[PDB]
Design a protein around this ligand. Structure first.
Ligand code: NA
Ligand SMILES: [Zn+2]
Ligand SMILES: [Zn+2]
Ligand SMILES: [Zn+2]
Lengths: 23, 145
């Protein structure tokens, strides 16, 4: 990071949201 | 290594068709995996356009070969110890978003280094997780509607 930490946080947020949506 | 080969094919085809805007011609699971990826990969990019633009800006990718920071990002994503298909598809979809932007700056860019970078994190770091669920069948079934 800090840019790389922020990108990762964002991708994880969307990914878990998208997982939750289909799970 | 059929799993790696299959995974690279699916991911490359998606990234390439996203970047060029045209589909490729010429297994059954790979076809269905690609159809699923089109549907759900396009879906994740929706509502998240602003976030993807923001991430792309911060990534600051200099050229088609500049994949080290993206690889580091993807390893970091999984570093909480959690693995699921929503994260994986989001990583691939962001890869597509990046491949698109590479084509805009240089039309003859190979999307292949990016696709290899993603396939590598996926297959090498989640090998046994993928094998256990018959690979892409896990993906197909998870996103089955
Ligand atoms: Na190159
Ligand atoms: Zn955010
Ligand atoms: Zn193993
Ligand atoms: Zn199945």
């Amino acid at each position: 990071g800090r840019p790389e930490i922020w990108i990762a946080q964002e991708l994880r947020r969307i990914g878990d949201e998208f997982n939750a949506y289909y799970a | 290594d059929e799993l790696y080969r299959q995974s690279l094919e699916i991911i490359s085809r998606y990234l390439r068709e996203q970047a060029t805007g045209a589909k490729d011609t010429k297994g059954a699971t790979s076809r269905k995996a690609l159809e699923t990826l089109r549907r759900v990969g396009d879906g994740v990019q929706r509502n998240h356009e602003t976030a993807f633009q923001g991430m792309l800006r911060k990534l600051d990718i200099k050229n088609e070969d500049d994949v080290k920071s993206l690889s580091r990002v993807m390893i970091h994503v999984f570093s909480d110890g959690v693995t699921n298909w929503g994260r994986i598809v989001t990583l691939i979809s962001f890869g597509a978003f990046v491949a698109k932007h590479l084509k805009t700056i240089n039309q003859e860019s190979c999307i292949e280094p990016l696709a290899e970078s993603i396939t590598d994190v996926l297959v090498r770091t989640k090998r046994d997780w993928l094998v256990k669920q018959r690979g892409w069948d896990g993906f197909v079934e998870f996103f089955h509607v």
